[PDB]
């Protein structure tokens, strides 16, 4: 049920998504081990993901959270990086996409820093890097991130090193 619509680089929607990608890059405490050494990206394509069933799945739950939190979904746009991006865009997020060993328990993790999500694209800790060169810092191979609408509702605040 999923279709992918390309955005033209001229579409202001392409431009605002690119700007969130680029402007939320940071340096990482691992010196680039997990995700590679870079200060910015070359954006090859941005596609709108359309799936009516998955969208209605999202908005149904959104209204439930909202109704439990004085009509405030507390909705954000956040990045997700995963080896399972293709299963995610076709079948939606579920338990198979959770980070069992995450610092806040076994859930589905999202980042404000694009460069944080980039560290997970080839797996946990960058896995063994790109399929073709086994290079966590590969400058050649094409990577994919998701920029996601996430309902946070009432969020438990965890201060954390």
């Amino acid at each position: 049920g999923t279709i992918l619509i390309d955005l033209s680089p001229d579409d202001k929607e392409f431009q605002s998504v690119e700007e969130e990608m680029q402007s939320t890059v940071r340096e990482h405490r691992d010196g680039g081990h997990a995700g590679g050494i870079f200060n910015r990206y070359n954006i090859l394509k941005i596609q709108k993901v359309c799936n009516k069933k998955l969208w209605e799945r999202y908005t149904h739950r959104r209204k439930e959270v909202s109704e439990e939190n004085h009509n405030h979904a507390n909705e954000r746009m956040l990045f997700h990086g995963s080896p399972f991006v293709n299963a995610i865009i076709h079948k939606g997020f579920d338990e198979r996409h959770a980070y069992i060993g995450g610092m806040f328990g076994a859930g589905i993790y999202f980042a404000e820093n694009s460069s944080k999500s980039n560290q997970y694209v080839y797996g946990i800790g960058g896995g063994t890097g790109c399929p073709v060169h086994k290079d966590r810092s590969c400058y050649i191979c094409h990577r994919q991130l998701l920029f996601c609408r996430v309902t946070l509702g009432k969020s438990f605040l965890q201060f954390s090193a």
């Binding site: 998504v17 940071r26 405490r29 590679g36 870079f38 200060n39 990206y41 070359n42 954006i43 090859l44 394509k45 941005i46 709108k48 993901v49 998955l54 799945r57 999202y58 149904h60 959270v65 439990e68 954000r76 746009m77 956040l78 997700h80 991006v85 995610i88 865009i89 939606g92 997020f93 579920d94 338990e95 610092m103 806040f104 328990g105 076994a106 859930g107 999202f110 980042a111 404000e112 980039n118 590969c138 400058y139 050649i140 191979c141 990577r143 994919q144 991130l145 998701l146 996601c148 609408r149 996430v150 309902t151 946070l152 509702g153 009432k154 969020s155 438990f156 965890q158 201060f159 954390s160």
Partner: protein
Amino acid sequence: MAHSPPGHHSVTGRPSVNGLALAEYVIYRGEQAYPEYLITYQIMRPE
């Protein structure tokens, strides 16, 4: 998959050492996220 803390819908990982780190978030229900954009890209070697 775990559960949200009782009375909450998500967890926020507030950065607490690295002053430049932004927040990270966790949801415990797949239906609380919709993947709006698929972005294809390369990281670039710094000059």
